[PDB]
Short mmCIF file of C-alpha atoms in Angstrom, two decimals:
data_model
loop_
_atom_site.label_atom_id
_atom_site.label_comp_id
_atom_site.label_asym_id
_atom_site.label_seq_id
_atom_site.Cartn_x
_atom_site.Cartn_y
_atom_site.Cartn_z
CA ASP Q 1 107.56 110.55 78.46
CA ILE Q 2 104.09 110.72 77.96
CA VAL Q 3 102.54 112.88 80.38
CA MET Q 4 99.18 110.77 81.40
CA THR Q 5 96.35 113.69 83.49
CA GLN Q 6 93.64 112.17 85.63
CA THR Q 7 90.72 114.22 86.78
CA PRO Q 8 89.19 114.71 89.03
CA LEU Q 9 91.57 113.90 91.69
CA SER Q 10 89.10 113.03 94.16
CA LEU Q 11 85.34 112.03 94.05
CA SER Q 12 82.80 111.35 96.47
CA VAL Q 13 80.33 108.56 94.88
CA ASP Q 14 76.34 107.29 96.62
CA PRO Q 15 76.19 103.74 96.13
CA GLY Q 16 74.29 103.35 93.22
CA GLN Q 17 74.67 106.39 91.67
CA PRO Q 18 77.52 106.66 88.63
CA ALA Q 19 80.60 108.22 88.17
CA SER Q 20 83.58 108.45 85.94
CA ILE Q 21 87.18 109.58 86.24
CA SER Q 22 88.54 111.44 82.61
CA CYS Q 23 92.73 110.64 81.50
CA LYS Q 24 94.75 113.04 79.18
CA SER Q 25 97.27 112.02 77.30
CA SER Q 26 100.14 114.47 76.06
CA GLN Q 27 100.24 112.09 72.98
CA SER Q 28 98.60 109.43 71.52
CA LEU Q 29 98.04 106.23 72.90
CA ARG Q 30 97.54 104.97 69.43
CA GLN Q 31 99.80 102.02 68.20
CA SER Q 32 100.96 100.78 64.67
CA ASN Q 33 98.97 97.55 65.66
CA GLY Q 34 95.74 99.36 65.77
CA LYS Q 35 95.59 98.68 69.52
CA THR Q 36 95.93 102.03 71.93
CA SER Q 37 97.85 101.47 75.32
CA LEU Q 38 95.69 102.95 77.88
CA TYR Q 39 95.09 100.40 80.89
CA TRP Q 40 92.90 101.49 83.88
CA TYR Q 41 94.00 100.11 87.74
CA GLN Q 42 92.46 100.13 91.14
CA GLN Q 43 94.14 99.99 94.43
CA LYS Q 44 91.21 99.33 97.62
CA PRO Q 45 92.56 100.38 101.42
CA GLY Q 46 96.48 98.19 102.34
CA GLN Q 47 96.24 96.50 98.56
CA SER Q 48 98.18 95.79 95.63
CA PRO Q 49 96.45 98.08 92.09
CA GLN Q 50 94.53 95.26 89.73
CA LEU Q 51 93.94 95.27 86.68
CA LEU Q 52 89.81 96.61 85.24
CA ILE Q 53 90.40 97.52 82.13
CA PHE Q 54 92.68 97.03 79.30
CA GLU Q 55 93.79 98.99 75.80
CA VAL Q 56 90.73 101.66 76.64
CA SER Q 57 87.80 99.20 76.97
CA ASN Q 58 88.43 95.43 77.40
CA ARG Q 59 88.03 94.21 80.55
CA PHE Q 60 89.47 91.63 82.46
CA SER Q 61 88.69 88.44 83.43
CA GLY Q 62 85.99 89.17 85.96
CA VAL Q 63 86.20 91.57 86.27
CA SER Q 64 82.80 93.69 86.59
CA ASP Q 65 80.83 94.72 83.66
CA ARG Q 66 80.33 97.56 85.84
CA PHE Q 67 82.94 99.22 84.76
CA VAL Q 68 83.60 100.85 81.07
CA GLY Q 69 86.45 102.09 79.27
CA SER Q 70 85.96 104.66 76.17
CA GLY Q 71 88.01 106.69 74.11
CA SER Q 72 90.97 106.99 72.60
CA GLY Q 73 94.03 109.00 70.88
CA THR Q 74 94.82 111.35 74.13
CA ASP Q 75 91.19 111.27 76.03
CA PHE Q 76 89.73 108.49 77.80
CA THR Q 77 87.46 108.07 80.66
CA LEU Q 78 86.26 105.20 83.17
CA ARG Q 79 82.60 105.18 84.51
CA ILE Q 80 81.89 102.75 87.01
CA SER Q 81 78.26 101.97 86.60
CA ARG Q 82 76.14 101.90 89.85
CA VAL Q 83 78.77 102.27 92.08
CA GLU Q 84 79.60 99.57 95.18
CA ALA Q 85 80.84 100.38 98.44
CA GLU Q 86 83.32 98.53 97.66
CA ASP Q 87 84.76 100.80 94.85
CA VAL Q 88 86.35 102.86 97.30
CA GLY Q 89 90.06 102.52 96.74
CA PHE Q 90 92.79 105.08 94.46
CA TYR Q 91 92.50 104.31 90.13
CA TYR Q 92 95.25 105.15 88.19
CA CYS Q 93 95.43 105.06 84.28
CA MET Q 94 98.73 103.83 82.18
CA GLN Q 95 100.32 103.92 78.98
CA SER Q 96 102.28 101.46 77.36
CA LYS Q 97 102.78 103.15 74.03
CA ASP Q 98 105.82 103.87 75.00
CA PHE Q 99 109.02 103.70 77.35
CA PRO Q 100 109.20 105.24 79.98
CA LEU Q 101 105.56 103.28 80.76
CA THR Q 102 103.45 106.33 82.99
CA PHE Q 103 100.82 106.72 85.44
CA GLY Q 104 98.10 108.69 86.10
CA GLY Q 105 98.55 111.49 89.62
CA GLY Q 106 95.48 109.44 90.70
CA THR Q 107 91.51 109.28 91.95
CA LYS Q 108 90.94 108.49 95.76
CA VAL Q 109 87.30 107.83 96.03
CA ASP Q 110 85.10 108.11 99.10
CA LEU Q 111 81.85 106.93 100.26
CA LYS Q 112 79.30 110.45 100.67
CA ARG Q 113 77.77 111.13 103.66
CA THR Q 114 76.61 114.50 105.34
CA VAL Q 115 78.28 117.32 105.70
CA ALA Q 116 80.36 116.46 109.73
CA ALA Q 117 81.75 119.70 111.01
CA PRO Q 118 85.26 118.64 112.97
CA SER Q 119 85.18 118.56 116.95
CA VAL Q 120 88.43 121.10 117.60
CA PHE Q 121 91.51 120.01 119.93
CA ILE Q 122 94.12 121.58 121.45
CA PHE Q 123 97.49 120.19 123.63
CA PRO Q 124 100.11 121.65 124.51
CA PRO Q 125 103.70 120.02 125.28
CA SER Q 126 103.68 117.91 128.50
CA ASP Q 127 106.74 119.41 130.91
CA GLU Q 128 108.42 116.03 129.63
CA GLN Q 129 108.96 117.62 126.28
CA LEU Q 130 109.54 120.41 127.49
CA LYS Q 131 111.80 119.05 129.41
CA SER Q 132 114.27 117.78 126.08
CA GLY Q 133 114.62 121.54 124.67
CA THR Q 134 111.57 120.94 121.99
CA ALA Q 135 107.74 121.56 122.02
CA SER Q 136 104.92 119.66 120.08
CA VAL Q 137 102.33 121.57 120.37
CA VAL Q 138 98.95 119.72 118.40
CA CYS Q 139 95.71 120.22 117.27
CA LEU Q 140 93.12 117.10 116.41
CA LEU Q 141 89.97 117.64 114.11
CA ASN Q 142 87.92 114.53 115.08
CA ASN Q 143 85.08 113.34 112.67
CA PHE Q 144 84.12 115.19 109.54
CA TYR Q 145 83.00 115.29 106.47
CA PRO Q 146 84.25 115.57 103.86
CA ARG Q 147 88.33 115.93 103.69
CA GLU Q 148 88.75 118.98 103.16
CA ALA Q 149 89.91 121.36 105.88
CA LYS Q 150 92.54 123.99 106.35
CA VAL Q 151 94.35 124.78 109.77
CA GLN Q 152 96.05 127.22 110.91
CA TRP Q 153 98.45 127.88 113.12
CA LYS Q 154 99.10 131.40 114.77
CA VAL Q 155 101.13 132.16 117.69
CA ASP Q 156 100.96 135.32 119.24
CA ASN Q 157 99.08 136.60 116.09
CA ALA Q 158 101.40 135.55 113.77
CA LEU Q 159 100.83 132.62 111.53
CA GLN Q 160 103.14 130.04 111.13
CA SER Q 161 104.67 128.83 108.78
CA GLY Q 162 106.65 125.47 107.27
CA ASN Q 163 106.84 123.77 111.20
CA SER Q 164 103.96 122.35 111.44
CA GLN Q 165 102.78 118.34 109.41
CA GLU Q 166 99.09 116.97 108.86
CA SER Q 167 97.72 113.64 109.53
CA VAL Q 168 94.05 111.97 108.74
CA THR Q 169 93.16 108.92 108.68
CA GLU Q 170 90.77 106.41 106.14
CA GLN Q 171 87.45 107.63 105.94
CA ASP Q 172 86.17 105.87 108.73
CA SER Q 173 84.44 102.13 108.18
CA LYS Q 174 81.63 102.79 110.54
CA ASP Q 175 80.66 106.87 110.36
CA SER Q 176 82.45 107.26 107.29
CA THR Q 177 84.15 110.37 108.63
CA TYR Q 178 87.98 112.04 108.60
CA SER Q 179 90.26 112.91 111.51
CA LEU Q 180 93.19 114.98 110.99
CA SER Q 181 95.94 116.02 113.94
CA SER Q 182 98.43 119.02 112.69
CA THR Q 183 101.95 119.19 115.54
CA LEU Q 184 103.42 122.39 115.40
CA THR Q 185 107.18 122.04 116.17
CA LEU Q 186 109.09 124.32 118.41
CA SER Q 187 112.42 125.09 120.11
CA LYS Q 188 111.47 125.25 123.83
CA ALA Q 189 112.93 129.07 123.52
CA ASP Q 190 111.24 129.66 121.12
CA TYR Q 191 108.19 128.34 122.98
CA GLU Q 192 108.75 130.07 126.14
CA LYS Q 193 109.02 133.15 123.91
CA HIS Q 194 105.41 133.75 123.03
CA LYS Q 195 102.36 133.85 125.09
CA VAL Q 196 98.74 132.86 123.26
CA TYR Q 197 99.19 128.96 121.12
CA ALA Q 198 96.05 129.47 118.90
CA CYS Q 199 95.06 126.31 115.52
CA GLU Q 200 92.51 128.09 113.60
CA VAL Q 201 90.45 125.63 111.82
CA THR Q 202 88.33 126.30 108.30
CA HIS Q 203 85.65 123.91 107.22
CA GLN Q 204 83.15 124.07 104.98
CA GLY Q 205 80.99 122.35 108.11
CA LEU Q 206 81.63 124.81 110.11
CA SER Q 207 79.48 129.29 109.43
CA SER Q 208 83.15 130.45 110.90
CA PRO Q 209 86.66 129.24 111.39
CA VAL Q 210 86.73 127.51 114.59
CA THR Q 211 89.77 128.17 117.25
CA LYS Q 212 91.14 126.74 120.22
CA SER Q 213 93.76 128.31 121.96
CA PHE Q 214 95.73 128.15 125.06
CA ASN Q 215 98.09 130.23 127.22
CA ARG Q 216 101.33 128.44 127.86
CA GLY Q 217 102.17 128.31 131.67
CA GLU Q 218 98.32 128.57 132.20
CA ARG H 1 96.25 80.68 90.73
CA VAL H 2 98.63 82.66 89.24
CA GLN H 3 101.20 84.59 92.02
CA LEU H 4 103.76 87.12 92.54
CA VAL H 5 105.60 87.26 95.68
CA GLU H 6 108.66 89.56 96.71
CA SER H 7 110.84 89.70 99.37
CA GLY H 8 114.22 91.12 99.77
CA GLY H 9 113.50 94.36 100.68
CA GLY H 10 114.73 95.96 104.12
CA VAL H 11 116.54 99.57 105.46
CA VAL H 12 119.54 100.44 103.91
CA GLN H 13 121.69 103.55 104.13
CA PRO H 14 121.94 105.71 101.45
CA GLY H 15 125.33 104.12 98.98
CA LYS H 16 124.16 100.30 99.97
CA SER H 17 122.46 98.43 97.58
CA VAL H 18 119.73 95.94 97.70
CA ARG H 19 118.48 92.85 96.17
CA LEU H 20 114.52 92.04 95.49
CA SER H 21 112.61 89.05 94.89
CA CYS H 22 109.96 88.65 93.03
CA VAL H 23 108.82 84.25 93.42
CA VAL H 24 106.31 83.36 90.80
CA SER H 25 103.41 80.55 90.70
CA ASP H 26 101.27 79.22 88.57
CA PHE H 27 103.02 80.45 84.62
CA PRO H 28 105.39 79.60 82.36
CA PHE H 29 107.61 81.97 83.38
CA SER H 30 110.30 82.07 80.71
CA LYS H 31 107.29 83.55 78.08
CA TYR H 32 106.13 86.67 80.31
CA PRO H 33 108.40 90.80 80.10
CA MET H 34 108.47 90.96 83.99
CA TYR H 35 107.97 95.19 85.58
CA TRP H 36 108.92 96.62 88.74
CA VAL H 37 106.89 99.23 90.29
CA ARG H 38 107.28 101.27 92.67
CA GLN H 39 105.10 103.06 94.85
CA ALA H 40 106.05 105.61 96.78
CA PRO H 41 104.79 106.11 101.35
CA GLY H 42 100.82 108.47 100.28
CA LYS H 43 102.00 108.61 96.55
CA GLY H 44 100.78 106.87 93.28
CA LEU H 45 102.59 104.52 91.10
CA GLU H 46 105.99 104.34 88.92
CA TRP H 47 107.54 102.35 87.13
CA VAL H 48 110.95 100.98 87.53
CA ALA H 49 112.24 97.84 85.17
CA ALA H 50 111.26 95.78 82.38
CA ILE H 51 112.56 92.68 81.32
CA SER H 52 112.16 90.38 78.15
CA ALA H 53 111.17 86.93 78.47
CA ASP H 54 114.72 85.34 77.78
CA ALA H 55 116.24 88.10 80.02
CA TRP H 56 118.18 89.55 77.17
CA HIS H 57 116.77 92.85 77.29
CA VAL H 58 116.09 95.33 79.45
CA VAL H 59 114.68 98.75 80.39
CA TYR H 60 114.99 101.37 82.97
CA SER H 61 113.22 104.52 83.73
CA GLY H 62 115.34 107.84 83.62
CA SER H 63 115.09 107.93 87.79
CA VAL H 64 117.56 104.35 88.37
CA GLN H 65 119.12 103.83 85.12
CA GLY H 66 122.44 103.62 86.21
CA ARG H 67 121.78 102.19 90.09
CA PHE H 68 119.15 99.42 89.42
CA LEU H 69 119.98 96.27 87.84
CA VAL H 70 116.58 94.43 86.32
CA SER H 71 117.78 90.27 85.91
CA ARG H 72 116.39 86.77 86.17
CA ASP H 73 116.44 83.70 86.88
CA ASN H 74 114.11 81.43 84.33
CA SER H 75 115.51 77.91 85.78
CA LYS H 76 113.97 78.61 89.24
CA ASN H 77 110.31 80.97 88.36
CA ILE H 78 112.40 83.88 89.96
CA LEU H 79 112.39 87.69 88.79
CA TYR H 80 114.92 90.38 90.61
CA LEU H 81 116.14 93.68 91.15
CA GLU H 82 119.50 94.82 92.30
CA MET H 83 119.35 98.84 93.89
CA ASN H 84 122.59 99.78 94.23
CA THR H 85 123.49 103.66 94.60
CA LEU H 86 120.78 103.71 96.56
CA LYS H 87 119.30 107.38 97.23
CA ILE H 88 116.40 108.14 99.80
CA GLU H 89 114.08 109.34 96.69
CA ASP H 90 114.54 105.47 96.43
CA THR H 91 112.62 104.70 99.62
CA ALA H 92 108.87 103.04 98.58
CA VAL H 93 107.03 99.46 98.13
CA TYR H 94 108.20 97.98 95.15
CA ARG H 95 106.38 95.01 93.68
CA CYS H 96 106.94 93.03 90.37
CA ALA H 97 104.14 92.28 88.12
CA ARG H 98 103.66 90.54 85.00
CA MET H 99 102.71 91.65 81.45
CA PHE H 100 98.63 90.95 80.21
CA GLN H 101 99.92 88.65 77.63
CA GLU H 102 102.73 86.55 76.49
CA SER H 103 105.20 87.92 74.22
CA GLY H 104 108.29 86.52 72.35
CA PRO H 105 110.65 87.54 69.63
CA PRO H 106 109.71 86.61 66.26
CA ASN H 115 112.50 94.07 64.83
CA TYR H 116 111.68 94.97 68.31
CA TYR H 117 109.85 93.23 71.54
CA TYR H 118 106.83 94.19 72.53
CA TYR H 119 105.51 95.35 75.90
CA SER H 120 102.28 95.94 77.06
CA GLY H 121 100.96 96.77 80.64
CA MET H 122 100.47 94.02 83.33
CA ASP H 123 97.86 91.84 84.46
CA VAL H 124 99.24 90.39 87.77
CA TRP H 125 100.57 92.73 90.63
CA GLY H 126 103.01 91.15 94.38
CA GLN H 127 101.49 92.41 96.99
CA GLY H 128 105.08 94.18 96.89
CA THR H 129 107.87 94.77 99.83
CA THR H 130 108.96 97.86 101.54
CA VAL H 131 112.80 99.50 100.69
CA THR H 132 113.66 102.32 102.94
CA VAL H 133 116.32 104.44 102.34
CA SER H 134 117.86 106.14 105.00
CA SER H 135 121.00 107.50 107.33
CA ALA H 136 119.46 107.01 110.54
CA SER H 137 120.10 104.61 112.98
CA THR H 138 117.67 102.68 115.29
CA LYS H 139 116.31 104.09 118.04
CA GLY H 140 113.44 104.44 120.24
CA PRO H 141 110.23 106.70 120.56
CA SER H 142 109.58 109.57 123.12
CA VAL H 143 105.88 108.65 124.86
CA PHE H 144 104.04 112.32 126.09
CA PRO H 145 101.08 112.32 127.15
CA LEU H 146 98.01 114.44 125.31
CA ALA H 147 96.83 115.26 128.20
CA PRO H 148 92.86 116.78 128.55
CA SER H 149 95.04 120.81 129.64
CA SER H 150 93.87 122.44 131.06
CA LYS H 151 90.69 122.19 134.07
CA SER H 152 87.70 124.61 133.16
CA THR H 153 86.02 123.76 130.08
CA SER H 154 82.04 123.31 129.26
CA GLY H 155 81.85 119.85 129.44
CA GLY H 156 80.82 116.73 127.22
CA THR H 157 83.44 115.52 125.26
CA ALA H 158 86.92 115.90 125.98
CA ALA H 159 89.91 114.59 123.98
CA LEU H 160 93.46 112.54 124.90
CA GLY H 161 95.85 111.35 123.75
CA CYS H 162 99.90 109.93 123.29
CA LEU H 163 102.66 111.18 120.98
CA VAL H 164 105.40 108.96 119.71
CA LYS H 165 107.99 111.06 118.58
CA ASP H 166 111.09 110.72 116.98
CA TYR H 167 111.51 106.48 116.18
CA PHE H 168 113.36 105.26 113.95
CA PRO H 169 112.47 102.54 111.37
CA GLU H 170 109.06 102.22 111.64
CA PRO H 171 106.67 100.88 112.60
CA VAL H 172 105.26 101.49 115.79
CA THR H 173 101.62 99.79 117.46
CA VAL H 174 99.58 101.10 119.84
CA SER H 175 96.59 100.16 121.82
CA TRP H 176 94.81 101.87 124.32
CA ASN H 177 93.85 99.52 128.18
CA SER H 178 95.97 96.19 126.23
CA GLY H 179 93.59 96.48 122.75
CA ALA H 180 90.28 96.50 125.60
CA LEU H 181 89.46 100.25 124.07
CA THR H 182 89.00 101.02 120.16
CA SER H 183 86.37 102.55 120.42
CA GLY H 184 86.98 106.85 120.03
CA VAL H 185 90.40 106.27 119.03
CA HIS H 186 92.12 107.07 116.05
CA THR H 187 96.09 105.95 115.34
CA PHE H 188 97.82 108.43 112.55
CA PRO H 189 99.81 107.29 109.89
CA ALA H 190 103.57 108.48 110.77
CA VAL H 191 104.97 111.25 109.84
CA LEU H 192 108.41 111.79 108.60
CA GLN H 193 110.02 114.45 110.61
CA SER H 194 112.85 116.88 108.71
CA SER H 195 115.22 115.08 110.84
CA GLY H 196 114.72 111.58 109.47
CA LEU H 197 112.87 110.39 112.13
CA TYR H 198 109.34 109.51 112.42
CA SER H 199 106.73 110.89 114.64
CA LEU H 200 102.74 109.53 115.32
CA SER H 201 99.99 109.80 118.00
CA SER H 202 97.42 108.57 118.37
CA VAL H 203 93.73 109.92 120.51
CA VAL H 204 91.11 109.00 122.48
CA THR H 205 87.17 110.12 122.49
CA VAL H 206 86.23 110.43 126.17
CA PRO H 207 83.41 111.97 128.11
CA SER H 208 85.19 115.04 130.64
CA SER H 209 83.44 113.45 133.81
CA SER H 210 85.15 109.84 133.59
CA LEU H 211 88.91 110.99 133.38
CA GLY H 212 89.12 110.53 137.24
CA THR H 213 87.51 107.66 137.58
CA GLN H 214 88.96 105.65 134.70
CA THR H 215 91.86 105.08 133.04
CA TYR H 216 93.64 105.54 129.81
CA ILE H 217 96.97 104.22 128.81
CA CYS H 218 98.51 103.81 125.94
CA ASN H 219 100.29 100.86 125.28
CA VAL H 220 103.36 101.59 123.12
CA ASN H 221 105.75 98.94 121.07
CA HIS H 222 108.37 99.21 118.26
CA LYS H 223 110.01 95.72 117.88
CA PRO H 224 113.45 98.00 116.86
CA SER H 225 113.97 99.12 119.65
CA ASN H 226 112.86 96.62 121.99
CA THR H 227 110.93 99.14 122.75
CA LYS H 228 107.47 99.06 124.95
CA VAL H 229 105.69 101.75 127.27
CA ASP H 230 102.74 101.31 128.55
CA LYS H 231 101.89 105.69 129.07
CA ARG H 232 99.09 106.09 131.77
CA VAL H 233 97.42 109.48 130.39
CA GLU H 234 96.12 111.84 133.40
CA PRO H 235 94.25 115.54 133.80
CA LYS H 236 97.14 118.14 134.35
#
C-alpha cells in the first residue's frame, strides 16, 4: 500500500487570503507513461466529493483557477488563492499509481473568526432516568471558537476516563462558532456513590480553565 | 448531465448480504471502469472495489476481499456491489464513482482517478434491533444562579437505528438551538441531545417543548422541559 500523509489536519481561513494543503506519499507517484497519479477532491458540507485536480496540476473542467496543484515524486501541494467562504469543507488527496487506491487523511477547512470562549453548562441526570438504573451527566460548551477544546470529568475530584463521549456541531452559518456536548455515563449505583460532579473546560478563550459542578441530590 | 445514483442501502445484521445498485445517466457506461468508495461516519474516504469496463477484471481492497463482489450490467447502464459476510466495520456511506477518462484494453488494464461521484447510499451493519428513544429533560438545575443566559435541552437516549429528528415548540423555536450529531454507544444504541439557550427569567413564563420523532419505532414524543 502507498500511504498518503496529508497536512495540516485542519486549517482556518480568512476570505481573500491564500491557503495551502500538502500531501506526501510513502512511495513515488510517477507512472511509466510519465504521468503522476495524484488527485485532489473537495467535499463540501452534506455533499459528495468532487474532483478538483487530476494528475498533480490539471484542473477538472469548471473548477476555479483559484485552485492550483503542484509537486512531483512524493511531495504535493494544493494551494487555494483568494479563499472564499464557500471553500469550507474537507479536502482529500488520492493516488491511483497502484492498488489499493489510497486517500490522504483529509484536511478540514473552516472559517476564521475572533476567539470566543465557551459558555459552559452542566446538567445532572433527570429523576426519570435514574429510575431506570442509569445516570447520564451532560456538559455543554456553547458558541466557542476555535474548535480546539478540552473537557474532563471529575467526580469527587477523581478524573474520569473511558466513560464519556463528545459530540460537536458544525461551524455555525451565522456566528461561525462551534458548540460541543460531553456526556458522562454511570450506573445509578456508581452515581449514588459520589457527591460532587464537575466538568472542567480548557479553551484558549479562557484565561484559566472553567469548572461547572453540582452536588448530587441538591 | 453526467450522473450516478446509488440505492440498496439499509440496516442489516452481521453475516447478511446486501446488493447495492448504481444507476448511470448521460455517458457510455460500458466504456468506463467504475469504482466503489466508502466513507464511515465522521471518517475519511476508503476505496473498496474497481471493475473494468468489460466486467472481466475486478480489484478489491484487502478489507473486503473474499466478502464483496463487484459486478456490472452493461445492458442496463448499471453497476452493482454485492456485500456478503457483512461486518460492523463495513458501516459507511457507499458511493460509486466513474473513472475520469475512457479506458479500454488495447498487457494490463489501466485505471486512473475518478471524476463524478453519486450521492451515496448508507449501509449500517449492527446486531441491534429497532428501539425507540427515551427522552429525558436537561433541566436548568438547580435554582440559584446570577442570572443572564440559561440552557435547557432534551437527551434522546438509546435508540436504533438512525435517524431521529428533534425540533422545539413544533419548529417555532430555532433561535439558540443546537442539535448534536448522534453518537454510537458501546451498547450499539445511539444517543443525542438538543439544547437551547434562553433567558433565565423566562423559565417559568415561557414554554419549551422538544419534539422527538423516530420513524422506525413509530415514536413521537413531545417533552415539556421545566426547571427541577
